[PDB]
C-alpha cells in the first residue's frame, strides 16, 4: 500500500547523492515500474527487454505506442558549472548527450521494427509495440543542485526548446510519488 | 502507521466508486455536464494523472483536490491571487460518446480528425487565451493602480472503441501525439489509468 | 531572370482561382526546383521520384543528406471548416489535417523501408543522397487570403502553431515569397 | 524588361562580391564583430533566407536590406513602433571556426552539442525574453500614460566541414532539429544558399 | 475414383497434340493435385499461390520443404531437330531454359524467404514452406516424339546428367496415372 | 462401370486394411521381418509410391503387386530373364522404431545422422552392387557359352516424430535429401501416403 | 617455389598423425590458399572472413561470382564407425554425417539472409565479392590411409561417392594432390 | 637445391609459353584441332587442373603429361591394360569461341544453354558410353578366351567474354554447376588457373 511508496521514497532519499550507478537506479525504476508509468497521462505498460533485442520502453495498451525512456543517474550535471556569458548558462553535455542517443535509438529501434518483429514472430514472442512517434524521455540530474536563479532559468529555457524529448529529473519524478502521498492523506 | 492504512483505504473506495459510476454509465450518458459534475467531485484523481497540484474545470480552480472557493467568482482572480497555480492545467470534459475520427477515409490508410474533437481542442485553447488576455489585463491595471499565466491545456474526449482498427489508432495517434502544448486522453484510457491505480494501491 | 519569375507569378494569379487539378501544381512545382527550396534556410536539392519509389516531394540536404518530405495540395483545398463548432470557433478543415497524417504516415513509411530502398538504389546503380534523420513534413494547401474573417485567421492560427514537426504553408505565402524576392531586388 | 535586367545584374554582383568575401576570408578572420559588420551590410540576403522582411542584429533593425534608423537609440522602441514588425527575425552572428559538437564521443556513435553552440543558443533565447521583457514595460508605461513581440531567433556559427562522420552530421541533425523557436544555420550552408540564389538569378 | 482417373485420362488424351497453352495445363493440375502429388514418393501437399507472392509449389507435411515445379505444354521440344553430330541430338532450347528458369526462380523463393514469411504474418498467412533443399522439377514436353534411338539415348543422357532438376515429360505424368490405374484394376 | 466401381473398393478395403495394421502395432512390434513379410502383401502400393511396376524386397521380385514366381530362387536369374525389369527398385525394409538421428548434437542445431539410418543405406548400397556383379557374372558366362541393371535403392526405417525440434527436422532434410541413388522415406510418411491415396480414391 | 610445397609438405607430414587442433589446420590453410584451390578446377579466390559475418572457408569464383563454402576438420576425425553394422558393412561415423549438414545448413543460412550482408558490406564500404548461386560445399576431413580393410574402403567410397552436392575429401587426398603437382614440376 | 630452381625455370618458362600462345591467338583461331594439338603438348596443366594424372585428349593417352606410346591405336586397349588408370579425365576440347548461351532470352532474365555447348556435352557423354561399350566387350572377349571404366567428363568451350549481363553468368552458373558427370570450364576460366599457377609458382 502506501508503505510502499514510503519505502521508496526512503530508498529515493538514501541514494540521493551516494549512489552513481545507472544499473542500481535501473533495477529500482524495473522493479517498480509505476514510477515511470506515472510521468505519462496515458497508460503504459512496460516492455521486456527480449521484445526489442539502461534504456527502457512503456506502450501504450491501446495504440502499441512505445516510448523510449534514458535513465541517467541523479549525480548528472544539468548545466556545465561554468557560464557562457554572465547570467547564460550551457547545459552540460552529458544532457545533450543523453538526449542525442535517446534520439538515435529511437530512430534505430523504427528503422529495425521489421526485423524485430520477425524475430518475436519467429521465437513466440508476441510484439505489442509500434514506433508510431519519435517521442522520447530522458531521465538525469536533479533540479535542486540548480541554486541560482540563472542556473533555474537557463535550465528550464533549455528544456523547454525540446520538440520530443522531454527532460525530468530525478527529484521531480519522484515528487509525483511525494504527491501521492500528499493527495491520499 | 494506522492513519496510511486508513488512506489507501479511502483512495481504494474512491476510485472503486469512480470506475463503478463509469461502468454503470458508459454507454447511457452522453451530457456533458453530467460527466464534467462527476470529475469535479474527483479532481486528486486528475490532479495525480496529470501530475499537477492545481486543475481547472469550467470556471472553478481546484488544489490538491479541494474546491479552492473563490468569493469574487473570477477564476482569473484566483489565478492571479496565487503565483503557486501559474502553470495549472485547463480540462474540457466532453462527452465520452465524441467521434475521434471521420467515419470516412480521407486516402487509403489515412484517417482525418473529427470535426468535434479538433473543435474542442481550437475551443481549449481559445479558453487559454482568453485566460491569458484577462490575466495581463488584470495585471495592467494594477500598474496603472501602482507575467504569463501560461497553463496546459486538456482535452478528454471519445473512447478508443470505436478505433476497430490499426489505421485508426495510427491516424489518432498522429494527430494527438502532434499538439505542442494540447494533450488528448480518452474516457477509456482515463478510467484505464484509474485502474491502474487501483491496482498500484493493492 | 526576373522575367521568369514573373511569368511563373503570373501563371499562378491565373490558375489560382481556376485550377483544380493536383497533378497541374505537382508539375508546376516539379519544373521549378528552386520554389520550394526558398521554405527551408538550409540548402535543399530535389531528390528524383525514382530514388525513393498522392503527390509528394523530397528535398535533402546537400551537406548532412537530411530528407524533408513535402506534399502538395491545390491552392483551392479549404483550410478551416466552413461552419463553427462554437460561438468564433472554427474548426480546421479536414482535408487539411488528413494531410497531415498522410504526409506523416509516408513518412514513417519512408523511414522503415529505408534499408530496402537503399539496397535497391545499389542494385540498380543510384545513388542514394537522402537520409531519414528527423520526421519533418511540409504540407501545402489552400491560400491565406480567403480567410476573411478574424476568428478564421485565429484559428488558423491556432491550428498551424499547435502542430510539432508538419509545417503547413499556404500557396499565396509560398508565391509571396518569391515576390517579395522580387521586391528585394528592385 | 531592361530594368528587370540591371537588377539582376546589380543583385549578381553583389552575390558574387560577397561569396568573394567569404571564400577571401573563410579560414583567416575570426573576429566575431568582423562577419557581425559583413552581414549585416547585406541584410536583404538574410531576409530572403529566411524568408521575413524584418531583420534584427544586435542593436540596429533592418526592414527589407533596408536599414531604419531609430533615432531614440532602443531597438524596442523601433519594434513598439511598427504593428507589422511582430514577426521578426532575431539573428546573432557568431565566428564560423566555432565548434558544433564535441569531439569527444559520449558513446558509440552519439556526439553531445559543443559547449559553445548551445551556449550561444541560451545566450539569444535570453535576448530574445529580454526584449519581450521590454515590449512588455512599454506596453506597460503607455497604457498606465493612457500584444508579445515573439520574434523568430536564429544562429549562424561554424562551417559544416569540420563533421567529417556521418555520426558527426547525424549528432548535429538530432541536436538543430529538435529546437523549437532558435534555428542554427552554418555559415557554410548560409554561402551554399547564396550560391544556389546566384544560379536561379543567373 | 476410377472413373474419374479415366475422366482426367480422356481429357490428357483430347488436348494430348492440339491445346499449346500454358494456362491451360495448369488449370488441369490445379484441379487435380494428386496428378503432381504422385510425382514425388514423400507425401506433398500444394502451396496456396497467395502463400509465397505457371509454376506451383508442393510442400512436405511433416519436414515442410517444397519443391518447385515448372509446367510447360506437351508440344515443347524435348531435342533440337538437327544434330550436333551424327546420332548426337542437343537437348532444345525450351528445355534448358525452363530449367535455368525454375532454378532462378528456386533461388530467389530462398534468398526472399524472410520477407515473404513476414508478410504471410503480417496478413495472417500461415507459411507452411520451408526452402530446405534445392529441388525442382521441370514439366515438358512428350517422350513419344522421340521415335529414333539416337533420339531417346540423347534425351536420356540429358536428363541423367542433372542434379538438382527432375525434366519429366507429359507422357511419363499421365501414364503414371495410367499405372495406377493398371495397378488398381 | 461396375467392375471399375468394385476395384475401387477392393483397393480401399486393401488400403484400409494396410493402416489399421499399421497403426495396431506402430510402436510395439519392432521387428524388421514382420514389417517385410507385411510390406510384401501389398507390393503394388510400393509399385505406385516409388513409380516402378517391379521392386526388390529381400531376394523376391514383384511385378504389378504379383508374387513372380521364379523356380531359380536366385533374384538375378529373374532380373536377366525379363529385360523390361532392367530398373527395378530394390526395397529394403527397417523397423519403424529406428532413430534417424543422433539425440546428442554434432553443435549447435546441427544433429548427425544415427548410426542405423547410414547402415542401412550401406547395406542397400552394398546389396545393389551384389546383384549388379552377379548380373554381371551371368551375362560373361553366357557371353562365354556363346548389360548393367543400375536398380533403384529404397530405405525406409524410423518415423518422424524422433525429430520432434526444428533442427532434428532439417538436418535429417539435409541429410536424406542428399542421395543419390537412395531414396530415405520413414514408416509415417509411408503410411501417410497411403492415407493420401485413400483420400485420393474416395 | 619448389621450396614452399616441400615446407607445407613437410609441415603436414609432421602435423598429420599427431595434430587434433581444428585452429591449427584452419591456420595453416588460410596461410597458404593455393593449398585449399586444388580442389577445384575453375579459378577461386579467398573471401575475408568479415564478408559474410564450426570453421568454414570461402571460395569464390572471380568470373562468375560463385560462392563454395568449405568445411575443415581434423585429420584425426573417424571416416567411419570402427564398428560394423552387418559382416563388412561399416555405417559412416557420425563426425562425417555432422558435418555434412553442418555445412549445408551454414550455406542454406549464408543464402537466405545475403541480402543483409550485402546491404551490410555497402554500407560499410566493403565490395561483396561473393555471390550465391549454387549449393556447393567441400568438407575436409579424416584420411583416407586409416581404411585398411577392403569393406572398410568399399563402404567409404559408397558414402562419399553417394552425396549430392557436397564433396567429403580427406587431407591426405588434398595433399597429395599438392605432392602430385611437385612431381609433375619435376 | 639448384635441381629445384632449375625445374622452377623450366616450369615458368613453359606456363609463359602457353600464356603467350594463348593470348597471341585468343580472338584469332577458331580451329579446333589446332587447340587440341595446343593443349596436347602441355597436358600436364590439365592433368593437375582436374586431379587426375592420365587425360585422354581425343583417342591419345597422357600419363602425367607424357605421351603413352599404346601400339595398339586403341585407347580401350591401354585402358584395359592398365587397371590404374580407370578413372582418367576425358577431355574433349572445342574452339573458344563456342557460344555459351543464345543470344535470345527464354524469359526475362533466362538465358537457355546454346545449342553448341549441351551438344558438345552430349558428344562427350556418347563418347564416354562408347569407351565404355569397348572395354565391357573387351573384358568379355578376355573372359572367354580365359571392368568399368566411367571416366570422367571435360568440355572446353567458349570464353566468359560473351556472357556480361549478371543474367547471363547466372545461367550458365545454374547451367554447368547442375551435371553430375560432367565438368564445363571455359577457355578464360582455365588459362585463367594457369595464370594463377604462375603466380603461385613465382
Redesign the interface.
Known sequence: ???NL?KVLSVWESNKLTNTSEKFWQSVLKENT?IL???F???TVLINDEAYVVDFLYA??????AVLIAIKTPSTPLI?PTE??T?????H??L??????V??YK?TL??E??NI??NN?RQGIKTDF?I????CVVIAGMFDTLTDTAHR??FE??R??????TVITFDELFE?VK??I????
Request: hydrophobic content about 25%.
Open positions: 500500500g502506501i508503505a514510503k509505476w508509468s506515472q510521468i497521462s496515458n497508460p501504450n495498451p491501446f495504440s502499441k505506442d556545465t557562457y556569458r547570467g547564460v548558462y550551457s547545459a553535455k552529458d545533450t548527450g543523453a538526449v542525442t542517443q534520439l538515435t530512430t523504427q528503422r521494427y521489421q518483429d520477425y514472430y509500434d508510431i512517434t519519435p517521442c532559468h537557463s529555457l533549455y523547454k526548446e525540446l520538440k520530443n524529448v509525483r504527491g501521492l500528499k493527495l491520499l492523506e
